[PDB]
Design a protein around this ligand. Structure first.
Ligand SMILES: CC(C)(C)C(=O)CSc1ncc2ccc3ccc(Cl)cc3c2n1
Length: 148
């Protein structure tokens, strides 16, 4: 069990981390983003959290940019009402860390490199995915040019 707090309201974890019900309620988490196609929404039937599923796979062809804006608003929703958000996928946190890094670029105004350094400092194990890196690099281009 290990929920990594990126921001006071934004938490990063894997499949096993999302199953620790006691820790999630201790940290005042009320929102969960599940970035998998096959994993269940843990503790859904208990009616404690608001869920959002980004149906993605951990492949070199998966497009995560399409899920960026939807995830940012769910995070803002958790932020604007004083609750924490947990975003998770599987062991390598490749998918979920990509979304978190994207959020830090758009809203916290950090650069792509600095955002990775920020998350990597708090979450030491992140599996590599050149496809997601390319999408984050292309995403930084659009932010600097005023396209998104
Ligand atoms: C995208 C994701 C977080 C899923 C990932 O690929 C983690 S693995 C890794 N390993 C070595 C690196 C060396 C420089 C670097 C500069 C920028 C960015 Cl975003 C990543 C790296 C980098 N990332």
């Amino acid at each position: 069990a290990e929920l990594t707090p990126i921001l006071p309201f934004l938490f990063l974890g894997n499949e096993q981390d999302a199953q620790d019900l006691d820790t999630m309620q201790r940290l005042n988490i009320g929102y969960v983003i599940n970035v998998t196609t096959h994993l269940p929404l843990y503790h859904y039937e208990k009616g404690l959290f608001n869920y959002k599923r980004l149906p993605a796979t951990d492949s070199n062809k998966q497009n995560l940019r399409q899920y960026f804006e939807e995830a940012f608003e769910f995070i803002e929703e958790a932020h604007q009402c004083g609750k924490g958000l947990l975003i998770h996928c599987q062991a390598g946190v490749s998918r979920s860390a990509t979304i978190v890094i994207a959020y830090l670029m758009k809203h916290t105004r950090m650069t792509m490199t600095d955002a990775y350094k920020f998350v990597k400092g708090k979450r030491p194990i992140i599996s590599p995915n050149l496809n997601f890196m390319g999408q984050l690099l292309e995403f930084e281009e659009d932010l600097n040019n005023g396209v998104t």
